């Protein structure tokens, strides 16, 4: 231990360029170890962009459909397609995305921001109408100014 640098937030900052569904580019800052869906929520994106992670014991996690370029395909975390997490991802692809799926389609909670994501450009993918319960649904149209960040709780019930 010596005269080495004091830790700053700028050492742990990750910048991601996000293109929303209107084509507008956005600058999104996050921290290392934070997932991508959390940084998207804290940036101030509307609540129609997000949906529950459809696994058991993880519906309190919000998730988004993102398009990831081929260079950053290998930095998405690995999911066993035979495990229960794999069936959760399969349920999300079956029910939420459907025929908006591309070869670049991932889910934003499965991306953990590190230094390798610095400068990565992603885009928000479209989703189909869905319902979890009466207090959390999506009718299909992204016409709402309510941010996801302003919701005090994520309710599974």
């Amino acid at each position: 231990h010596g005269p080495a640098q004091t830790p700053t937030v700028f050492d742990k900052l990750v910048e991601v360029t996000v293109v929303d569904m209107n084509g507008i580019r956005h600058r999104v800052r996050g921290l290392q170890g934070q997932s991508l869906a959390q940084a998207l929520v804290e940036y101030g994106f509307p609540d129609t962009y997000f949906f529950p992670n459809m696994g058991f014991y993880t519906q309190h996690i919000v998730d988004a459909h993102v398009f990831v370029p081929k260079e950053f395909w290998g930095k998405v975390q690995n999911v066993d397609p035979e495990s229960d997490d794999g069936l959760a991802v399969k349920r999300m692809f079956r029910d939420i995305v459907q025929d908006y799926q591309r070869d670049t389609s991932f889910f934003a909670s499965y991306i953990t921001l590190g230094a390798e994501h610095n400068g990565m450009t992603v885009g928000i993918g479209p989703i189909k109408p869905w319902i979890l319960h009466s207090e959390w649904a999506f009718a299909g149209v992204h016409d709402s100014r309510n941010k996801q960040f302003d919701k005090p709780t994520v309710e599974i019930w």
Binding site: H1, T6, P7, T8, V9, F10, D11, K12, L13, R27, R29, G30, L31, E42, Y43, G44, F149, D150, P152
Partner: protein, 253 residues
């Protein structure tokens, strides 16, 4: 200068404004909204009678606000985690923006204790953190999970305290690493102890109590003398809005 009347308040303009020097008793609310920003709190919260919680504030679970503490959410949002304790006369504020470019809301994780006379402004405090007394954590700074800040310490803006360590000084430097038992049990112990003290205070509170009897006696005496004024506040708010609209229309053309 800024006027003190708001015609676009959610519940309308203020019909009767009382000067503070004309008040004969203390009317300070402990939980109150600022225009359209209402605080959010659970059923088992402890808010001390001389503490102030105003604006856009979210409180969760078994959190507590002790005597004389201020949580002012007027420029941004403040979030207080599950079983997090704000001790006596500590201040939590938030700026509109931070130099790092991140969200400027003050976010406090669960099981976080903040010792007396400490100040948090637009900082990020992760779960299980002890902030010492007379300590300041500035705008955009980050305190990581399972870490301890010694008393009378300054964390300058956009600075970071790494996880699992004890830091202290002005400016804050490395002191030592926490033991594994300290990270496993002691931080939760401090948070649980202060929650137990808050529960002891919560059990003995008679709300709303009986201090209103004197003020009601004075109002009864005014009704006896015929000097109590009955004001139709809804109709006065309606008429004031109509007059404001007419005055706005009678100047553009």
């Amino acid at each position: 200068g800024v006027s003190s009347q708001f015609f676009d308040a959610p519940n309308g303009p203020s019909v009767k404004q009382v000067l503070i020097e004309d008040e004969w008793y203390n009317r300070q609310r402990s939980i109150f909204p600022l225009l359209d920003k209402e605080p959010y709190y659970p059923v088992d919260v402890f808010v001390a009678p001389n503490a102030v919680v105003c604006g856009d504030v979210d409180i969760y679970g078994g959190a507590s606000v002790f005597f004389g503490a201020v949580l002012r959410g007027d420029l941004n949002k403040i979030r207080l985690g599950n079983r997090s304790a704000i001790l006596d006369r500590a201040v939590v504020h938030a700026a509109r923006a931070v130099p790092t470019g991140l969200n400027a809301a003050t976010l406090i994780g669960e099981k976080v204790t903040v010792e007396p006379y400490a100040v948090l402004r637009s900082c990020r405090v992760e779960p299980k953190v002890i902030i010492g007394a007379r300590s300041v954590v500035c705008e955009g700074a980050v305190v990581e999970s399972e870490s301890i800040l010694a008393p009378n310490s300054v964390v300058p803006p956009a600075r970071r305290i790494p996880s699992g360590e004890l830091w202290g000084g002005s400016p804050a430097k490395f002191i030592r690493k926490l033991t594994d038992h300290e990270r496993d049990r002691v931080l939760d112990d401090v948070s649980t102890h202060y929650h137990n003290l808050a529960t002891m205070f919560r059990r003995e509170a008679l709300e709303p109590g009986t201090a209103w009897r004197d003020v009601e006696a004075w109002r009864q005496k005014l009704v006896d003398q015929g000097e109590y004024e009955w004001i139709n506040f809804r109709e006065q708010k309606y008429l004031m809005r109509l007059q404001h609209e007419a005055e706005a229309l009678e100047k553009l053309t």
